[PDB]
Structure formats: C-alpha cells, structure tokens
Design a protein around this ligand. Structure first.
Ligand SMILES: [Zn+2]
Ligand SMILES: [Zn+2]
Ligand SMILES: [Zn+2]
Lengths: 511, 89, 365
C-alpha cells in the first residue's frame, strides 16, 4: 500500500506546485523531495522483504509489478537493484528446480515446469516492464547461468519436441503449433551443450521415421528450417542428408513403380516397398550384422541390388539387420500378420516346414542374440486371445525343445493384426547415451585443436601467456575456456614439432 | 502353406567407392605418391601422404587437394562444399 | 506403447478392401456404409473416401467423386493430421491423371487449390503450387506460372520485406521455377538477379534436384562472366545433387563440370574419381574422358584429333563451342611452356611444326 500512497503524494505535490506557483519553481522542490523519499523508502521496503519484490512476484501480482516499474524508472539505479533482486529470486527458483539430489523425477514434467516458469516470467515482463531491455538481458544471463549446471536438459528438450512432433493431437490447427515451436526454439536459444541435444534429435528422427511413415510431412520442413535459422553447421548437414535420403527413397519408389508397370517377368515382387538410405546419415547402430534373409525378401533385395548396380552404378549396397517391417498373410478367415524383419526368418523356416524348435531356428538361420528372443516371444509369449504361433509347453520362460503350431483364432477378425512388442520404451538406456557423449566429447576435443592450429598458423605466438587469450576468445562462443585443461594440453605436443616448446626449456618453439 | 509373406518395408544401406586408378592435381595415380613428394624415401616417416576422400566421394591425395585449397583460392570447394570424410584408401 | 484406434471400422474397411476386387457396385456401397458407421469425421472412413474416389474413377462416376473429394479436403483440416493426407491426395491426383479429361483434371486441381487456400495448408500448399509450376515448365507455360510465382512471393512477403527467414525453402522453389523459366527465355540479367536473390535468402533445407538446378544456373552464369572457380564449384554441387537424385541432366551437368575444371588451368582432372568404370566408360562421357586424358598428358595432337572426331558431341553445345577456342589456347600455351622449359634460344618454325599450327599463331602465343 505504500507505493500507491507515494504515487498519490507525487501527484498531489506536483499538482499543488503547478497550480499554486510559477514556472521557475516546480522542478527543484519535487526533484529533491522525490529523490530523497523514494531512495530511502525504496531501500528499506524493497530490500527488507515486507510485501517485497520476491513476494509480490511469487504470488503473481501484475498491477503491483507494473506500478513498481512505472515508479522506479524515474530514479536512477532503481532498475539495477530491481533486476538484481529479480535475478536472485530466479536463481533461488532454479536451484529449487534444477536440484539433482533425489532420483525419480519425470523428464517431460521437468521440462514442462521450466517452460511454464519461462512463459510466466515472459508474460510478467510483457505486462509490467513494457519489454525493457535490461530485464531481458538479466533474465537471459540468469538462464544461461543456472541452466548449464546439468547435462540432461537437452535430451529432455529433445524428447519434448519429439512428443510435440509425433502427432498434433493437441492443437490441431497451425497457429498454436507455430507459437509453441517458436517458444521451444527460444528456450533452446539460452541453452548450452548443443551436441547432445542435436544427437538426441537425430535419434528421435530415426525412431519416428523407421517406425512411422506419416509423422508430419509438413512440419519436418518447419523443424529443419528452424534448425537452419537457429544453429550453425555441425549436424544441420546431418539433417540435410537425412532428408535427402527420404527424397531419394521416394524418387526410387516412383521410378521402380514405373519399372514394374513395364512387365516384371517372374512373381515374388507382389507388393514391395524398398527404400534407399545412405550410410553417412543413418548410422549402423552396433555392428552392421550379417543375418539371413527370407526368400521373398531375398528376391526383393536381389532385384533392388541389380537395379542399383545397373542404373546407379559407382556404389555398392551393404546389408544390415535392424529396421523394416512386413505383412504376413496367414490363414475361419485369412488374417494378415506383421513381422519386423527379425521373426520373418523364423516364419521362412516355418513356411518350409513348421513344428520346429529353438534349436532349428538358431542352427539353420545364422540368427543374432537375445534380440531374437524378444522377436520370437512376440508371437507366443504374452499374447492375448489372437495367438498365431502357439506351443505345447505353455510357460513364461523360453525353453529349447519346444514345438510351435498355429491356431486359426477366428476371434481375430482384424485382417491387419500386428504384434508391436518392439518399441516398448524410448528412454534411451545409458549405454547409447554414454557412447554418444564420449563421441561428442571427442568431437569437441579435436575441434578445439583444429581451431587453435588454424588460428595460430595465421597469427604470431607468445612467451608465457599471450596466445591463450586469443583461443579463449575464439572458443568463447563454444564453451568455457578451461584454462587448466588447455595449459596441460599445449605442453603435450613438445615431444613432437609443429611449434612445440623444446624439452630442455619450454620457451623456444619449432617456428 | 500356413504362413505367407505379403509385403516388405526393408531399409537398404549403400557405400560409396567409385574406385579408380588415377589422380587429378599430380596426374600420377590414386596411390604411389604425388608431384610434391616423388619418391618413397627422403624424410617420409612411413610415408605421411595418404588419400583424402570427400563427401562427394571424389578421391585425391591429401597433399594434392590440400594445396589446391591453400594455394590458388579457398573459395572453390570450401568447407561448405568439400568435406573431409576419410583419410586413406 | 499401443493405442486402441477402433476395431469395427478397421474390420469393415478391410472387408471392403477385399471386396474391391469383386464387383465395384458393392465395394462402393460398403465403403459409403463405412462412413455411415462412425458418421462424425472418418479416420478409417477418411481412407474409405479415397477408396470410393478410386473405384468411382474406375466406373467413371465424377460428380459425387468430386463432392467426396471436397469432403476429404475438409477432412485434411480435421482430426486426421495433414501428414498422410498429402500422400493420399497426391495418389488421388495421380489416379485422376490416368485418364485424359483435362477439363475434369483442372476442375479437380482448382477445387484442391481453393480448399488448400482455405485450410492454410502452407507447406502442402506451396508444394502443390510448385508441382503445378513444374508441370507448366514441362509444357513451357508462363501465363499461369507467373501468377503462381507472384502469389508464392506475396505469401513469402513479410509485408515490409519481400522474404521470410524460414520460407527460404519457399523462395528456393520459387527461384527454381524462375530458373527453369529464364533458361527457356535465356535471359542472362534476370538469371543473375535470380541467382543473387537465391544465394542471399535461400539458406534453408533444399530438395536435391532444386539445389542442383540452382547450382547449375549459378555455374552457367559464372562461366558466362568468366569465373572458373565459382563455376566449377557450382557444377560440382549440381552434379553431386544429380548423382543423389538420378535426373537425366546428370550427364549434361557432368560435361559442364568437365569443361569448367579444364578452364581453371593448374592441371586438374574432372574425370578422375566419379568418372569411373560406370561413368568413365560411358559412351557419352568417354569423349570427355579422352579429352581430359590428353589434357593431363598435354598431347595437343591427340586432343585436336578427338575434338575433330567427336565434334558432334564436343562443340555441339554452343557454350562449349565458344569455350573451345580458349581451351585450345590454354593447352597450346601449356605445351609450348613445357617444350621451352628445358632449354633456350629455339627457332619459331620448329615450335610451329611441333604445335601443328601457323607461325603467326605461335608468335602471338
Ligand atoms: Zn599424392
Ligand atoms: Zn612424399
Ligand atoms: Zn573431401
């Protein structure tokens, strides 16, 4: 209530002096009065706490913040302490939110809370501070300060954007989608460690493209355009190649449709969907496996390889076993199944002759490890009353000498029943996270060496501590200078040449 | 049969080779040194001169296209157009 | 993960899919009854509408076909995301394209255009307009191409600015259309203006064919002006894009790249790597391979013999015809310099006989 009283005091004083006196008066009296009173009472009341800035900002009082901004703008050094207190409150809130102690926190909920806090602060700024530059700079610096204390935030943002991109069930129209994407990229602007963020974005791209074929078809372009306008060129070229692969895949699809429109000699190519992807934009995953191929898939792969070596010569295909899908026409009705490129070898062995066992499908298949077990248990283990691959030894755990049969199961009226045992979770189990963290760390560790050599080859040198400043300046936009690490690393090249330092005395370099 | 495969949605990966037996800047060969090094001996230290591969799969000696990027100009096939995707054949 | 979509809708949709190979009169009725099952929207009835349009196109039933296509256009801006609807409508347009009733084809096209305008289907919309523009260029049409270009540019206009920052791909497609057009009218000034505007604002994700076309135009402009490095780089990127895509323009772009790389002097080879057993031995590229082989070997006599032997595919291009004089001058200069390096004080007629040219040309060189 003091702020309204002092504003009324200012208004009444200025009105009384302007109506009751001359023009050469006014400014001195009101100037000194407001100076002294505002300075003293501001100090006391807005740095004590009593209905202070922290409390009036926590509960969300828009009028109080607006009147405070409009009153404190007249006196110098008021906005400075206002922004300092706001930054202190933001630091406290972040430390209460970015707390690492305690396991069992939801990533998407954490990102949603951070985004809600950012949006609330932006709304308060727009409503009260009239888009002041100082407040924006202070909040940006504070976000940069409290956001880089961890390393799981970028992956959580990636999973949030994957959830927003997989389906636009929330916000069917386009305006709100555009606004939320803009807010997401604005939040990403004040974020560090872009390497792991973009790696997880590529992982989400691989997950959504190799399992879904109708993701957005219109928002992918918007996503990658925002990446172009936001990031530089490190993995944006990776995304370029990723989309180039889809373009070439559809061009190959239509030209192959023209190919089978002109005859086709034998059958086996009944209904095929072959795709062309490059190795430099889609990673292997683990090892480029060498498993077997079912017969109709064998014919399809042979035809595709012959075409690619005939009309796209100069490059050879490499076979791998991680991705794909197929429809298995089974047969009282004819229900078509779905096999994800792994159990279809077992179904090949069954097409030749069923009533096999685990030994039969592990000996005459060149089949991989426990991923085989997960693929095989899809048709038998954990199955509802639409079982298509039944066994006599009904049990949960998998045996070796167990026979497989078939049940018609007329209850399965669905003619495109699928068994989606794969893609149970998308949590990115530690192994791959750690390996890609090591990969991006090595990427940074050789990028810094490339920068230091490329710059100091076009520049001069130092005696004790001159060049470190230039490399920190040119790596300022990348990450922290890390003086100890660079100091320990620059002296490791002395056992070689390229402007070393000389073992006997570290001061004469190989110029 | 009791089961029959109808469709397939395979993913086919491919690798880039365009293997040839000639060079461009030194006019000698893909391997067996270049104009700036001639012989195998005379301070090679296991012949520190290998083959450089670009994103477009074109192949040159590392030294050849390195001096190409250094001597005449850097703009033709710069870091935006020509990448460094491999080292050695 | 899993999500129960619907059981009965899928069951009847598959029943009608099986029925489609039977008499179409019953398949259409069953598909129309699938839309009656849910009533509101469609989901599986969305695909049922597409199947009904296909079967009606089989038995030449267009009026209700277009009414139900309007229903699908309204369904695009519905619970069905505008993701698979674009592929579905591309397939419907291709199916309509099977027949030859151009009036019906363009009625379909205009209804689609207006519906997509109403649905603010920005990406889908300029994709459709770009496809229409490519069709017009393939038929050398500019009356409606100009209108489409103006509309797309206005959509790209940020009021004060004539360009956005994320509609860079939009302007990229627009400039690809205009590059094809001004290749038809060979307007050099408009070509350079387009290339400059593209280089500045186009920075975005390209489609490989579009990037290849724009880089081909840039290389043409640069080698028309005189820049050899820029033209070589542009032909390089265009030929890489053509290698990725597969367009027939790959051979012509490779020939232009071969010409450009020979003009930057300093002894570089364009047939070395990509022109291999597949491409080096290509009948249309073997002549260029032999030319650059002679260029490497500095064999002026063999080079001129190959020029005269394959003149129907060496200087046939008016541009290569223009540049053959400069190429001959450069190769003769290189041979002369190599010949006169090891010694001094050499007579002119011997050089003229070695170069198989006139004495005056030797003196001028
Ligand atoms: Zn070399
Ligand atoms: Zn050497
Ligand atoms: Zn390279």
């Amino acid at each position: 209530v003091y702020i309204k009283k002092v504003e009324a005091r200012i208004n009444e004083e200025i009105e009384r002096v302007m109506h009751c006196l001359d023009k050469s008066t006014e400014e001195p009296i009101v100037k000194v009065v407001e100076r002294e009173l505002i300075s003293k009472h501001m100090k006391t009341i807005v740095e004590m706490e009593n209905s202070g800035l922290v409390h009036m900002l926590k509960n969300g009082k828009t009028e109080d913040l607006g009147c405070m901004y409009k009153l404190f703008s007249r006196v110098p050094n008021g906005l400075k302490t206002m922004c300092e207190c706001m930054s202190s409150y933001l630091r406290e809130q972040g430390k209460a939110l970015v707390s690492e102690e305690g396991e069992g926190k939801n990533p998407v909920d954490y990102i949603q809370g951070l985004l809600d806090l950012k949006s609330r602060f932006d709304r308060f700024l727009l409503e009260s501070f009239n888009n002041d530059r100082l407040f924006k700079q202070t909040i940006a610096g504070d976000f940069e300060y409290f956001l880089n204390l961890n390393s799981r935030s970028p992956e959580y943002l990636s999973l949030f954007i994957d959830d927003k991109l997989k389906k636009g069930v929330k916000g069917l129209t386009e305006q709100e989608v555009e606004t939320i994407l803009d807010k997401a990229m604005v939040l990403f602007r004040f974020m560090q460690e872009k390497d792991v963020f973009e790696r997880y974005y590529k992982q989400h791209l691989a997950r959504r493209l190799l399992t879904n074929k109708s993701v957005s078809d219109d928002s992918e372009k918007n996503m990658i355009s925002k990446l172009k306008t936001e990031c530089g060129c490190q993995f944006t070229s990776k995304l370029e190649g990723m989309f180039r692969d889809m373009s070439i895949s559809n061009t190959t699809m239509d030209e192959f449709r023209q190919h089978l429109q002109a005859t086709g000699v034998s059958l086996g190519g009944v209904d095929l969907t072959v795709r062309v992807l490059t190795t430099g934009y889609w990673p292997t995953q683990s090892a480029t496996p060498k498993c077997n191929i079912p017969p109709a898939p064998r014919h399809a792969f042979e035809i595709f390889r012959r075409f690619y070596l005939a009309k796209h010569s100069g490059r050879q295909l490499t076979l791998q076993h991680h991705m794909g899908s197929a429809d298995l026409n089974a047969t009282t009705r004819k229900h078509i199944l779905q096999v994800s490129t792994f159990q279809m070898t077992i179904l090949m062995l069954f097409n030749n002759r069923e009533k096999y066992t685990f030994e039969e499908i592990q000996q005459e298949t060149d089949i991989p490890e426990r991923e085989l077990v997960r693929a095989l248990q899809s048709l038998a283990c954990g199955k509802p009353t639409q079982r298509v691959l039944t066994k006599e030894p009904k049990s949960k755990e998998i045996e070796n000498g167990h026979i497989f049969t078939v049940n018609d199961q007329f209850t399965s009226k669905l003619h495109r029943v699928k068994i989606q045992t794969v893609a149970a979770k998308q949590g990115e189990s530690d192994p791959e996270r750690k390996e890609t963290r090591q990969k991006v760390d090595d990427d940074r560790k050789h990028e810094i060496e490339a920068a230091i050599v490329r710059i100091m080859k076009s520049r001069k040198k130092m005696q004790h501590n001159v060049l470190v400043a230039e490399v920190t300046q040119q790596l300022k936009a990348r990450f922290l200078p890390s003086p100890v690490v660079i100091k320990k690393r620059i002296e490791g090249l002395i056992e070689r040449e390229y402007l070393a330092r000389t073992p006997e005395d570290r001061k004469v370099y190989t110029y | 049969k009791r089961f029959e495969v109808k469709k397939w949605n395979a993913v086919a990966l491919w690798a880039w080779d365009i293997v040839v037996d000639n060079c461009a800047i030194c006019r000698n060969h893909i391997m067996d040194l270049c104009i700036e090094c001639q012989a195998n001996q005379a301070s090679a230290t296991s012949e520190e001169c290998t083959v450089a591969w670009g994103v477009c799969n074109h192949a040159f000696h590392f030294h050849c296209i390195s001096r190409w990027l250094k001597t005449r100009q850097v703009c033709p096939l710069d870091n935006r157009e020509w990448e460094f995707q491999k080292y050695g054949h | 993960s899993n999500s129960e979509p619907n059981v009965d809708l899928e069951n009847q949709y598959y029943n009608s899919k099986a029925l489609k190979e039977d008499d179409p009169k019953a398949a259409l009725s069953s598909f129309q009854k699938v839309l009656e099952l849910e009533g509101e929207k469609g989901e599986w009835g969305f695909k049922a509408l597409k199947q009904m349009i296909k079967i009606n196109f089989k038995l030449t039933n267009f009026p209700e076909m277009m009414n139900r296509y309007k229903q699908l256009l309204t369904y695009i801006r519905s619970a069905v995301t505008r993701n698979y609807s674009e592929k579905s409508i591309n397939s419907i347009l291709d199916y309509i394209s099977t027949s030859k009733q151009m009036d019906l084809l363009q009625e379909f096209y205009e209804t689609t255009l207006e519906a997509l305008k109403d649905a603010k289907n920005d990406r889908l919309w300029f994709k459709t307009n770009t496809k229409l523009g490519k069709l017009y260029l393939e038929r050398e049409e500019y009356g409606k191409l100009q209108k489409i270009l103006r509309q797309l540019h206005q959509s790209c206009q940020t009021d004060d600015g004539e360009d956005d920052l994320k509609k860079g791909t939009q302007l990229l497609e627009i400039y690809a259309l205009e590059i094809q057009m001004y290749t038809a009218q060979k307007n050099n000034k408009k070509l350079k203006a387009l290339y400059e505007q593209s280089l500045h604002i186009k920075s975005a994700i390209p489609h490989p064919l579009i990037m290849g076309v724009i880089r081909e135009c840039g290389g043409k402009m640069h080698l028309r002006e005189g820049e050899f490095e820029k033209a070589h780089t542009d032909f390089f990127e265009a030929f890489k894009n053509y290698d990725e895509s597969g367009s027939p323009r790959r051979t012509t772009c490779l020939k232009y790249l071969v010409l450009a790389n020979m003009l930057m002097k300093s002894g570089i080879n364009p047939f070395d790597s990509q022109e291999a057993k597949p491409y080096k031995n290509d009948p249309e590229i073997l002549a260029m391979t032999n030319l650059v082989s002679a260029y490497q070997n500095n064999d002026i006599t063999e080079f001129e013999k190959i020029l005269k032997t394959n003149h129907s595919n060496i200087m046939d291009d008016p541009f290569i015809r223009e540049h053959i004089e400069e190429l001959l001058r450069n190769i003769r200069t290189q041979v002369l310099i190599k010949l006169i390096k090891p010694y001094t004080r050499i007579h002119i007629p011997f050089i003229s006989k070695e170069l198989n040219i006139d004495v005056a040309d030797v003196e001028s060189l």
